[PDB]
Write an enzyme that holds these catalytic residues in place. Structure first.
Site, PDB file in Angstrom:
ATOM      1  N   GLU A 357     -10.718   1.611  14.955  1.00 43.93           N
ATOM      2  CA  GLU A 357     -11.623   2.584  15.498  1.00 43.93           C
ATOM      3  C   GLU A 357     -12.619   2.374  16.104  1.00 43.93           C
ATOM      4  O   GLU A 357     -13.163   2.905  17.225  1.00 43.93           O
ATOM      5  CB  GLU A 357     -11.865   3.684  14.414  1.00 43.93           C
ATOM      6  CG  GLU A 357     -10.692   4.203  13.751  1.00 43.93           C
ATOM      7  CD  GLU A 357      -9.748   5.179  14.508  1.00 43.93           C
ATOM      8  OE1 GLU A 357     -10.396   5.848  15.632  1.00 43.93           O
ATOM      9  OE2 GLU A 357      -8.429   5.299  14.448  1.00 43.93           O
ATOM     10  N   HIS A 487       7.903  12.258  18.003  1.00 42.83           N
ATOM     11  CA  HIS A 487       7.418  12.246  19.285  1.00 42.83           C
ATOM     12  C   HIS A 487       8.280  12.823  20.208  1.00 42.83           C
ATOM     13  O   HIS A 487       8.026  13.142  21.205  1.00 42.83           O
ATOM     14  CB  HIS A 487       7.234  10.673  19.402  1.00 42.83           C
ATOM     15  CG  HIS A 487       6.279  10.055  18.539  1.00 42.83           C
ATOM     16  ND1 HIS A 487       4.847   9.805  18.540  1.00 42.83           N
ATOM     17  CD2 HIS A 487       6.530   9.205  17.451  1.00 42.83           C
ATOM     18  CE1 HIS A 487       4.493   9.303  17.528  1.00 42.83           C
ATOM     19  NE2 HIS A 487       5.558   8.636  16.728  1.00 42.83           N
TER      20      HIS A 487
END
Ligand SMILES: *[C@@H]1O[C@H](CO)[C@@H](O)[C@H](O)[C@H]1NC(C)=O
Ligand SMILES: *[C@@H]1O[C@H](CO)[C@@H](O)[C@H](O)[C@H]1NC(C)=O
Ligand SMILES: *[C@@H]1O[C@H](CO)[C@@H](O)[C@H](O)[C@H]1NC(C)=O
Ligand SMILES: *[C@@H]1O[C@H](CO)[C@@H](O)[C@H](O)[C@H]1NC(C)=O
Ligand SMILES: *[C@@H]1O[C@H](CO)[C@@H](O)[C@H](O)[C@H]1NC(C)=O
Ligand SMILES: *[C@@H]1O[C@H](CO)[C@@H](O)[C@H](O)[C@H]1NC(C)=O
Ligand SMILES: [Cl-]
Ligand SMILES: [Cl-]
Ligand SMILES: [Zn+2]
Ligand SMILES: [Zn+2]
Lengths: 595, 98, 595
Positions: A357, A487
Site C-alpha cells: 500500500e 472478475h
C-alpha cells in the site's frame, strides 16, 4: 484562434473543475469506508451522481473536437481519455438493458447460496464456509461436491444472462469503431501518434502468446511436481500421466495454489521464515510497521510522506465502534492528500502488505504534477507492479535481519530457499496458465470465433491443453463456468493480472543491475540504492503522460514485453524441479478423464 | 474550512498578460472561440475567474499561503520614511560624543 | 550560388520590367476606353503584343527552374503563376486551330441575328430588342418564339464548333499534368506547399455539392412561390405540381430573375425604397456621389484615395463628343495609379454601383506593396465579394437616412423588408441553381462522364432536377443550349459567380459580429466600425501572397467554405415563404412537360 487553442482552454477549465469535484467524491467515499453510517452513505450517493453527471456533460462538449487537426501529443492523449463516449453510443433501450444485466449478475454472485442434500437448513454462501472447505478439507468427495454444486447453481442461472451480455457488449464496441468488446479491453495498451514507440492492439495477442511459450517449460515441471505429491494425499484418483482434477487445486476456481503448500511442501521438517513471533517480543504495533516501511522507501531515494498522511489516515481499527473495511486500499483523494485504509495487525502478512500500500502512494505522488486526465499509471498493470516489487524486496532474509526482525545468529540454507521459491511459484507463476486461457477464451467469444453452442466445450478443451486440468464430471452445455468468477461476471478485465506479473520481474531485474547485486534474483534488495530509486522515479513521475513502451525503456530498457526475467527468478527452482521430476513422465494427457 | 473556503477567486483565462503592478477586476466572459457569445456562458464562452475552495486536509502544495509584496522605489524624494535610529542615556560631567 | 538565389534574382528583374510594361498597356487601354479613336486603337494594339510577347519570353526562361528545390513559399507561388506554359504545350497546328475556334465563337455570338417569319426585314440582334421582349413582354407565344429561335440559330451553328472545342481543351490540359480542362479552372483554388491549409482540386467539387444541399430548401420554397404567382399572369400553361418553362424566367437564359419582380411582387401597393427623386431635389451630381461614398469607406478605417484619382479618372460623360464605354470598370494601371471609368448618373443604381467600383480600388490599394505576380486577390471570387458587401451595406435604410437621402420622418415596416429580401433573392440566390448545374455539367463534359450523343439529354435532365425548369418544346441533339451563354462560348469561368456569392455572406456575417449588430443580417451597416475595417484590411493587404484558406480565417474564421451565413441572411424571408407556400404542393415534378 485555431482548434488547438480551444482544446487547451477546455482542458485548463476541466482540470480545475475535475480536481475539485473528484476530491469531494473521494472524501465522501473515504468517510463511507472509514465509518459505515447512513449519513456517510448519502454523502457518497449525491457526490457520486454529481461526479458522474459532470464527467458526462464534459465528455459531450469534448465531442465537438475533430481531434485530427491537433498535433500536440499531450493534448491528444487527454482528449482520447475524455471524448470516449462508452455505452452511450447505443440507444436508450440497449443502455438500460445492458445495465440491468450487470446489476443482476453482481446480486446473484454475491447473494448466491447453494443448498445441500445432507440437511435442508445447512446452506452456506460463497466467501464463508465454502472457501474453507476448498482450502482445508482433505476429503475427496467433500470438496468434489462443493466444487460442482456451486457452478450448478450459479452457472445455470448466469448462462441465459451471459449469452445476452456478449451480444450487447459486441454491438457497443463495434459502434465505437472497434472490432469487438475484447478489443476494447486491449485498447489500453494501444499507442499511436508517435513514431518508434507505437503498439497496435493486435500485437498484444501475439505478445502474450509468444511470452507464454517460455512459461510452459517452467509450468510443466511445476505441474508434474504438484501431481506427484498429491498422489499420496489423494490416492486412487490421480493418474500418473493424466491431468489433475479441478477440485484439488486448493480453491473453487483454481486461481491460486497457496492452499497446496501444506500438501506439496518440499521440506516440511523446517518451518518457513516467519517474523510474527519476533514482532510481539519487541512490542511492535501498526505505527512501528509504517515507520520501518517509510525508512525503506527513503533509503532508495524517495521523498517522505505528507503531514496529512500520518494524521488523517487510520492505520488501526478502533474496535467494534466505527465499522470500516478491513481490506487494504490506497486512497488518493488528490491535491496532496494521500491516505491508506488498512487494519494493520501484528503479522508478517501485514508487514509485506504495508509496503504494498505504501508503494502505491509513492507512485501516486510521483505523477502529482500531471493533469487529472493523466494522473494515472502507464496502464492497468504498471500500478500493481511497482507495489509488489517493494514487498518482495522487503521479504528477503537480508532485509529482515537488517531492521531487527531476524536474529543475527541465523544463516539461510538451501532448504529454506527452495521452500520460499516454491511457495511463491504457487501464486505468481501458478496463475499464469489460468489467466492465459481465461483471456484468450473470452477474446474469441466477443470476436465470434467460438459459436454459442461450443462455449463449455472450448473452455474445458483449453483447460486440458493450457493449464492441464481435467474436468471431474461431464458438464452439459447449459452450465457456465467462466461466469463463476468474480472478475468475469462483474465486467472486470483479467488480463491486467498477467501483464503485471511479467512487469514485476522486469522491474526487479532492472533494479538488481543498478544495485550491483551478486547473487540470485530472489535475494536482491533495492535498499540503500540511490541509483536504482532515481532511475525508477523517472518512470513513475511520467505516469500516463507518456506511452508504456517509452516508460518501460527508462527502467528496464526494453521496448517490448519480455518474459525472460520471469524465468531467471525461478531459475534455482527450475533446476531443482527438473532434478526431482525424473521418476515419472513429465506432462499431462488431455485424453484422460476421471469419469 | 471543512466545507470549503470558496471566498478566494483567481483569474484563469485572459486575452493578454498583465503589465507589472497592474490591477484588473474585469469579469467579462473570455472569448475562446470565434464569436463573442453576446456575453453568455456556454461552449467556448468561459468565465475568467475561478474559485479555490481551500480545505485543511489538502497537501502542502495546495494549502493557502498569504503572500505580501513590499514594493520599494526611490524618486529623489526627501525620504520621509525612516526606521528607528538609536536610543541611549545622557552622560553628565564628562566629555563624550553626541 | 544555389537555385533559390537565381530565382529571386530573376523575379527582381521581372517585377521591375513587368510593372513598367503593364503600366504602358494599361495606359494605352485607358486611352482606348476613354476615347474611341483610331489613334488610341493603334496604341492598344502595339502595346498589347509588346506585353504579350514579354510575358511569353519571360515564361520560357522561367521554365529552366525545376521548382522542386525551392522551399520559399513566396518565390514558389510567383513562379507557378509565371512558369505556366498554357496552350503553348500543344503543336503548332493545334494552337492555331484552337485560337480559330475561339475567334469564330465570339463573332457568331456577337453578330448573331435571328430572322422572323412575320416580316423578312424585321430581324434583331441579341442585346437590343430581343432582351426587351424577354423582360417586359407578357405574351406567352411572343417570348416562347424568341426563346427558341435564338438557340435554333446560334446553338445549331455552335454545336459542330463546340464538339471540337472540348477535345482540344482536354488534350491541352492533360499535357499540363492535369486530368481535364475542367480541372484547370478548379486549379485556382488549389493550395499546396503549406501544411494545415492545403486544398485539393477534387475537394472543390465536394464543397460545392455539400453547400448546395442547404440551398435547396431555401430555393424550393422560392421556386414554389414564383410558380404560384405566375399562374395568374400565365394561365393554362403552368402546372400546380409541375416545373416552370424556360421562357418565363425573365431572361433569355434564366440567369437572373430580376425581371420577375414586377409580376411576383408580394406587396405592390407600396413602392420600393428609391432615392432617385431625393437626389435631384438636393442638386446632386456624379462628384457628390463619390464624395459621399468616400466618406463611407474612411469611416470604416480605410485610407483616402490618391490625388491622381480625382484628377485623371473621368466620372462623368462629356456628351457625344468623346466616345467612352458606359460600363463601370475599375482600372488599376499600377505604380499608385487608380482610376474608375463610369458614366455615373443621378440614379440610385449608380449610387450602389459607385461603392462597388470604389470598393475594388480599396482592394487594389491594399496589396499594392506586393509583387506584380501576387498583385491580385485570393482567387477569382474574392475580388467581387468585397465590392458587393459595400453596396449592400450602403443600400440599408439606416445608412441612407444618415447621409441625408431618406427623410427622418420615415420608419421601416415589415412589408418593405419582405419586398427588399425577395427582390435580392431573385438575383443572389436565384442564380445559384443555374450556376450549380452549368458548372457540374461542363465538368463532366471535359472529364468524359457524358458522351457526345447525350449532351442535350443530360443538360435538360439536370435542369429539371436541380433548377426545376422544364423545356417548352423538344429539342433535337443537334442543338447546343450551353453555347448560347456568353461566358461559355467565350471560354470564361462561371464558377467564380458561385463562390463569390457564398463568400459575400461570409464577410457580411463576419463584420456584423465586430460591429456589435443587434438585428437581422440585412440591416447591418459596417459604417463607423473601426474594428471591422482593421480586421478586413488585414486580409485585403495579403492579396495573393497567402492562400485563400488562410485569408478567409482572418475575417470569417473558417478554414472551409460555408453556406450557413447565406441562409441567415434570408432567414426572415425563409419564414415568410414557408408561411405563404402552404396552399399548394412544394417542389416540382420532373416527369411533367408542357408538350
Ligand atoms: C502541448 O501542450 C502542453 C500542455 O499545455 C504544452 O506545455 C506544450 O508546450 C504544448 N506543445 C505544443 C507543441 O503545442
Ligand atoms: C520524513 O520527512 C522529513 C521532512 O523533511 C525528512 O527530513 C525525513 O528524512 C523523512 N524521513 C524520516 C524517516 O524522517
Ligand atoms: C541499509 O542501510 C541501513 C542504514 O543503517 C542499514 O541498517 C542496513 O543494514 C542497510 N541494508 C543493506 C542491505 O545494506
Ligand atoms: C522568400 O521570398 C520573399 C520575396 O523575395 C522574401 O521577402 C523572403 O525573405 C524569402 N524568404 C526566405 C526564407 O528566403
Ligand atoms: C457615424 O455616426 C455619425 C453620428 O451618428 C453620423 O453623422 C455619420 O454619418 C456616421 N457615419 C456614416 C458613414 O454614416
Ligand atoms: C483625404 O486624404 C487626405 C490625405 O492626407 C486626408 O487628410 C483626408 O482626411 C482625406 N479625406 C477624406 C474625406 O477621406
Ligand atoms: Cl472452471
Ligand atoms: Cl437553356
Ligand atoms: Zn495493490
Ligand atoms: Zn465588380
Amino acid at each position: 484562434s485555431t482548434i488547438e487553442e480551444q482544446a487547451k482552454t477546455f482542458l485548463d477549465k476541466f482540470n480545475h473543475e475535475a480536481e475539485d469535484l473528484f476530491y469531494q467524491s473521494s472524501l465522501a467515499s473515504w468517510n463511507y469506508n472509514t465509518n459505515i453510517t447512513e449519513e456517510n452513505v448519502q454523502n457518497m450517493n449525491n457526490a457520486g451522481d454529481k461526479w458522474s453527471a459532470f464527467l458526462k456533460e464534459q465528455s459531450t462538449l469534448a465531442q465537438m473536437y475533430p481531434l485530427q487537426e491537433i498535433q500536440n501529443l499531450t493534448v491528444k492523449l487527454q482528449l482520447q481519455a475524455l471524448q470516449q463516449n462508452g455505452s452511450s453510443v447505443l440507444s436508450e433501450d440497449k443502455s438500460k438493458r445492458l445495465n440491468t444485466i450487470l446489476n443482476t449478475m453482481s446480486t446473484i454472485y454475491s447473494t448466491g447460496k447453494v443448498c445441500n442434500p445432507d440437511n435442508p437448513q445447512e446452506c452456506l454462501l460463497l466467501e464463508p464456509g465454502l472457501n474453507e472447505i476448498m482450502a482445508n478439507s482433505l476429503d475427496y468427495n467433500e470438496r468434489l461436491w462443493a466444487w460442482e454444486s456451486w457452478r450448478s447453481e450459479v452457472g445455470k442461472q448466469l448462462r441465459p444472462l451471459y449469452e445476452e451480455y456478449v451480444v450487447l457488449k459486441n454491438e457497443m464496441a463495434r459502434a465505437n469503431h472497434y472490432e469487438d468488446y475484447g478489443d476494447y479491453w486491449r485498447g489500453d495498451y494501444e499507442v499511436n501518434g508517435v513514431d518508434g514507440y507505437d503498439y497496435s492492439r493486435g500485437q498484444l495477442i501475439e505478445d502474450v502468446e509468444h511470452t507464454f511459450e517460455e512459461i510452459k517449460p517452467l509450468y510443466e515441471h511445476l505441474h508434474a511436481y504438484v501431481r506427484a505429491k498429491l498422489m499420496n494425499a489423494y490416492p486412487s484418483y490421480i493418474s500418473p500421466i493424466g491431468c489433475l482434477p479441478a477440485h484439488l487445486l486448493g480453491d473453487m476456481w483454481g486461481r491460486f495454489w497457496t492452499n497446496l503448500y501444506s500438501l506439496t511442501v518440499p521440506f516440511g521438517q523446517k518451518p518457513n521464515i516467519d517474523v510474527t513471533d519476533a514482532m510481539v517480543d519487541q512490542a511492535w504495533d501498526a505505527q512501528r510497521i509504517f515507520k520501518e516501511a517509510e525508512k525503506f522507501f527513503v533509503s532508495v531515494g524517495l521523498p517522505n510522506m505528507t503531514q496529512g498522511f500520518w494524521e488523517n489516515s487510520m492505520l488501526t481499527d478502533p474496535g467494534n465502534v466505527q465499522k470500516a473495511v478491513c481490506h487494504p486500499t490506497a486512497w488518493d483523494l488528490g491535491k496532496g492528500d494521500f491516505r491508506i485504509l488498512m487494519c494493520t495487525k501484528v503479522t508478517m502478512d501485514d508487514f509485506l502488505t504495508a509496503h504494498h500500500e505504501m508503494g502505491h502512494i509513492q507512485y501516486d505522488m510521483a505523477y502529482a504534477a500531471q493533469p487529472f486526465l493523466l494522473r494515472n499509471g502507464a496502464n492497468e498493470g504498471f500500478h500493481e507492479a511497482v507495489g509488489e516489487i517493494m514487498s518482495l524486496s522487503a521479504a528477503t532474509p537480508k532485509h529482515l535481519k537488517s531492521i531487527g526482525l531476524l536474529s543475527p545468529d541465523f544463516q539461510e540454507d538451501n532448504e529454506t530457499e527452495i521452500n520460499f521459491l516454491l511457495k511463491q511459484a504457487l501464486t505468481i507463476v501458478g496463475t499464469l496458465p489460468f489467466t492465459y486461457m481465461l483471456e484468450k477464451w473470452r477474446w474469441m467469444v466477443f470476436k465470434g470465433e467460438i459459436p454459442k453452442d461450443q462455449w463449455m466445450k472450448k473452455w474445458w478443451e483449453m483447460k486440458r491443453e493450457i493449464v492441464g486440468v481435467v474436468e471431474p464430471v461431464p458438464h452439459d452445455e447449459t452450465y457456465c463456468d467462466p461466469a463463476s468468477l468474480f472478475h468475469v461476471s462483474n465486467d472486470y478485465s483479467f488480463i491486467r493480472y498477467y501483464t503485471r506479473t511479467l512487469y514485476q520481474f522486469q522491474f526487479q531485474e532492472a533494479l538488481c543491475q543498478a544495485a550491483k547485486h551478486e547473487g540470485p534474483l530472489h535475494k536482491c534488495d533495492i535498499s540503500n540504492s540511490t541509483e536504482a530509486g532515481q532511475k525508477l522515479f523517472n518512470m513513475l513521475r511520467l505516469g500516463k503522460s507518456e506511452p508504456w513502451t517509452l516508460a518501460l525503456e527508462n527502467v528496464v530498457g526494453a521496448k517490448n514485453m519480455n518474459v525472460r526475467p520471469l524465468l531467471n527468478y525461478f531459475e534455482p527452482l527450475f533446476t531443482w524441479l527438473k532434478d526431482q521430476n525424473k521418476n515419472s513422465f513429465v506432462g499431462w494427457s488431455t485424453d484422460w478423464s476421471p469419469y | 474550512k471543512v466545507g470549503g473556503n470558496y471566498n478566494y477567486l483567481y483569474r484563469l483565462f485572459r486575452k493578454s498578460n498583465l503589465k507589472p503592478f497592474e490591477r484588473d477586476i474585469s469579469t467579462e466572459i473570455y472569448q475562446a472561440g470565434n464569436k463573442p457569445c453576446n456575453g453568455v456562458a456556454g461552449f467556448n464562452c468561459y468565465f475568467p475567474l475561478r474559485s479555490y475552495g481551500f480545505r485543511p486536509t489538502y497537501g502542502v502544495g495546495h494549502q493557502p499561503y498569504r503572500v505580501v509584496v513590499l514594493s520599494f522605489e526611490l524618486l529623489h524624494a526627501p525620504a520621509t520614511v525612516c526606521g528607528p535610529k538609536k536610543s541611549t542615556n545622557l552622560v553628565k560631567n564628562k566629555c563624550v560624543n553626541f
